[PDB]
């Protein structure tokens, strides 16, 4: 009997059968390498779909620029980035007329939020491209480095605290003839280390001051570095994109078509409501069709100039300063420069050699030495390449940075609802990459005529529908963002599942975080009761393994398990003991939002309650919900190097190695005989030698003459 | 030999730099250089705590009468340490201590 | 409802709905609030078993609300 | 150096045997998960 | 070496009805047969045929006393129903290393009722889901198999 | 360690701290030389501590080694490590040898 | 019938106990450190 798993589809609808095909909503490790080649291909494709536009030379950054907007309309079904401004303006006009007082209110709310916001908001983000060092650093570190450089350059926006002064100082820094900043430089090492020679070589960083001309800083600020996001943007762009996205979110929240920022069962409600609404107003005897459309090269076709036009149209009645503030982001994106990453690698098999060619030296060697695909890619990329290992890139959107504005543009495309006053009405939903289109007509022929008209219209707006990944069927069954809807039933394609291990804070905190994660997964991603209970079981298993807190009545052995077993033997209320103390777990679906301390309080032993919740215990000392007890301990978090200046100047003197060598013998002869606790190493040596001489004389290793000589020298030391 | 170490220490003290570094730098500071010399930071918090718990004294401890109330040893099991720590500026306690 | 969102994880799902009602300091009809549920369980135990009459009367005669038989409370 | 694109291969008969055998019931089990609190709500009973 | 040489060595040039067992191993056969064993045989208990290149079972004396037979490392693939008409008194069957395609090949053993142990190792039929259960309900007379019916005993 | 024991240096004798009553797998009492060999090999850090230290071999290549065997200066009294190649054991005559 | 006899061998699993024949002696383990020696019986 040869199994055939696909045969399940015979007895089960495919929508349910393929539920949760991918356990991971993130990124796999085996995805096609996103290196210099991938970014080169991305820029090549971005410039390829817009090569019929206007090509010119930027007078600021001196880089090639391509502008496809208002360019010739496509004559082929291939992707096109030529979005006419008039069509976009008309679509925005239609949206505004349909929703009176929407753009004004959204712009007002966005500007008020910007006025009340603070620079600290910029720290909530993923890896950010720091320009001072030209790398990827955490948001907080990047913001701190930018602030320090601004202070060095007589720019103190962060001092005022507001975000508006910070962005004003950013755009002012874009005007300084020379920009001075701090940078980190690594220098080799010569300090001792015991492997076989008491000598090792490493890298130590130091802070230095570096200055850059105006054009260099201008190019650096617009740079987009690469680490399914393809690149990250520095700090000079973060505030403006934040404001523009807040505006777009304010607009979208009141757009019934927008599929964002819906999350949870609200998504299912929106899907079913849209289907029901479209079916209700279907013409008597007409036909309703549904397209699960997808967009190819979504972010490689949208143009920053079109986003600038959308921002200008939306904020047509708003203070001029806010209009400029909103416009600062699209103009920055329209001049974005991509960084190609590390570079390539070329090898010689005959001599068994290999080397890494960095981006600036990409063209330093004949193209014949690159494989076919890289040769062609470099040949095509030559015009859009800079001498500093960067590529000019005017068009494109390099994945998600204006997702809300993309959704707004898609909703505008969906809001036309008719072309030529034909016998079809279209509508649907769209969330920043994917759209579901519902069209009502008389016969399927007119429905497909309407679908064709919608395809042409979105082409006019620069949105390219995917013919190779889209299909149409009678309304009632479709998909929308990995969520299959079928005549009321709803299923998910990919659902994130709890990862192995505890959260990584502490016993009570880890338990609370795990339970709240399970609860959130149930609420949002739609995890069934049995799956949630199994997740609880797995989390308990992992927690017990990590904290070595198996059941008190178990037969396992461990350093902590002996005390756990003794406590279990001495305790009467064994149902009230916490899991961390080998007690029984009692968590279930109905009580996934209650801390275990509160759950078990009524069953705890009063003596155990006092010991556990002692107001002054030595462990606690000085989101999720838990109880502050003896299980809220803190782990030692102290590493790296402090006292950097003193340590560096000491290590750079000379005699440190001799001190280490003298220390090593005596204080390694025994595993631990160090009077540690801030004792000066000289004092510890004096005490150690005094004790060694005492022991030598007592055992007879030394005569009285050597004894007295040693004490004489020890007397001369100063600690005797 | 005690005398050999003594004479070597005197010879080293003849030089000013060695005398200064020995007078100022403490035994606690001696460990720090070795750490960065052959140690650095890690990631993956879930596994980080897994490694930390298996160690002897991963838990920070407060200073006070209650901290000293718990013993150093218990049925052949260590609980805390006497010598002061650098980072926390206080004692460090083993996981079992909490259970105690 | 403030008291309904907190439990939402156990109330509503993608394709199921749990009928749940809140509570809070509804004390006074203690004895009654007890007997009913106890009685309910008896029926739940008797309907499944064959010939529910004798089993139901047996369980009802041998049940005590913490001091007294269910018959007195009823 | 040129990229070693994956080769092209025909149907492998051992994958069918893998699927057939891995779906059989053996004489041993290797799963021991911890316990959960008592079930009260009907949804908990269904999940259990 | 040939089947005849093995027959002569085992019988030592005596009457056919003098040995209740045979060892036909490492013997070349004409087109994959078991020649050299005449139908005159009347008493036989154990059999052993390994590396004989037997491709089919069509030549075998009619018998009523054999209880064990051993076939291995052969490319035989065909119906075994003929065993019922030739010797429906088999108790130990060994097909380890043989070449059988699907379950249908082992069907004709249903009509035999005295079989208690059947061996099928590294057989193309052995790599299937519920092959153990499917064979069991297909041959109810079977009391043993590759060795793990319910316990472990030795032949 | 072995050259130390063989040399019969008075410091090696004065560095003993335990006891010498060991035997072999056959259960025989050995001569004091081999008993000391086994004692010192079992406890290497016995004569090393009290042997005494000597300044490093200040020179182009001659460099010292500490008690921990790391290529660290402040070497043992007498011991020297040269960054050259020592080639020895010439004239392998295989001279006549008797067997008791 | 007796006590731990390393000579007879290590502890025997239930699989070997079930296939054992009458009159044959085996070794079993109750818990850690308390082995015992048993013998099959017809009754």
Swiss-Prot record, chain E:
Protein localization: Nucleus; Cytoplasm; Endoplasmic reticulum
What positions belong to coiled-coil segments? none
Q: How is it modified after translation?
A: Phosphorylated on serine residues, at least in part by casein kinase 2/CK2.
Q: Where is the composition biased (Basic and acidic residues)?
A: 147-155
Residue span(s) of domain LRRCT: 123-155
A molecular function GO annotation: histone binding
What keywords are assigned to this protein?
A: Cytoplasm, Endoplasmic reticulum, Host-virus interaction, Leucine-rich repeat, Nucleus, Phosphoprotein, Repeat, Repressor, Transcription, Transcription regulation
What is the tissue specificity?
Answer: Expressed in all tissues tested. Highly expressed in kidney and skeletal muscle, moderate levels of expression in brain, placenta and pancreas, and weakly expressed in lung. Found in all regions of the brain examined (amygdala, caudate nucleus, corpus callosum, hippocampus and thalamus), with highest levels in amygdala.
UniProt LRR repeat ranges: 18-38, 43-64, 65-87, 89-110
Task: State the GO CC annotations.
Answer: cytoplasm; endoplasmic reticulum; nucleoplasm; nucleus; perinuclear region of cytoplasm
Per the record, the domain of life is Eukaryota
Q: Where in this protein does the record say Phosphoserine is found?
A: 17
Residue numbers of Phosphothreonine PTMs: 15
A GO BP entry = regulation of apoptotic process
Keyword Oxidoreductase in the entry? The reply is no
Quaternary context = Component of the SET complex, composed of at least ANP32A, APEX1, HMGB2, NME1, SET and TREX1. Directly interacts with SET. Interacts with ATXN1/SCA1. Interacts with MAP1B. Interacts with ELAVL1. Part of the INHAT (inhibitor of histone acetyltransferases) complex. Interacts with E4F1.
Q: Which family does it belong to?
A: Belongs to the ANP32 family.
Protein's name in the database: Acidic leucine-rich nuclear phosphoprotein 32 family member A
Upper classification of the source organism reads:
Eukaryota, Metazoa, Chordata, Craniata, Vertebrata
Q: Span within the entire protein?
A: 1 to 155 of 249
